Amino acid sequence: PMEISGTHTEINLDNAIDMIREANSIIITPGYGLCAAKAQYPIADLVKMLTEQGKKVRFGIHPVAGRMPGQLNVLLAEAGVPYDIVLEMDEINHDFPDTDLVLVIGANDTVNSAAQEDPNSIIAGMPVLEVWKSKQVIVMKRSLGVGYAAVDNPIFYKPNTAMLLGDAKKTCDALQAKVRES
């Protein structure tokens, strides 16, 4: 007779819009989920608009994000994301504690805090994008399901993390449309 509970929070599009417009510095950490949904385009256009409003918007790429090395770099460039704002993990990782908002779009293992928090984790020690150190995290995926490493992500239950559930393309399209309504 054993039980363990986990509490996560879910936000709506309007709340996500509020957090986005409230933020001045934004880091986006894309993963396989963005690749699967082909969501590079709506996020590229969103970034473009947010940049035009004076916001600091950049991408943080894990060396092993997606299914191929450098896959996210290719897809973001295909969407026309300026190369200057596409940074690698080792360059951008130190900026997390000083960032207002992190949009985790279709990423999980690459942003899994258990790598540093759970000494008995199968991914313990593995370098990750330290997204949880930012003021606010929005995790954009279809649910609280696992990634490739088939492991639970403790960031889903962190106070500063909000889940924005749904297909990456669908969510990014909606956020792109609402921000355009200005």
Ligand SMILES: NC(=O)C1=CN([C@@H]2O[C@H](COP(=O)(O)OP(=O)(O)OC[C@H]3O[C@@H](n4cnc5c(N)ncnc54)[C@H](OP(=O)(O)O)[C@@H]3O)[C@@H](O)[C@H]2O)C=CC1
């Ligand atoms: N890059 C490489 O060379 C290779 C990488 N790998 C491994 O793959 C992983 C890559 O990391 P990363 O991609 O960040 O983490 P994951 O691949 O583990 O996570 C991808 C997440 O995206 C979500 N997702 C899938 N489809 C959609 C969708 N259409 N819309 C929104 N979300 C979606 C899934 O959650 P949900 O179901 O809830 O939507 C899933 O948790 C690493 O663990 C790495 O070890 C392995 C071999 C090669």
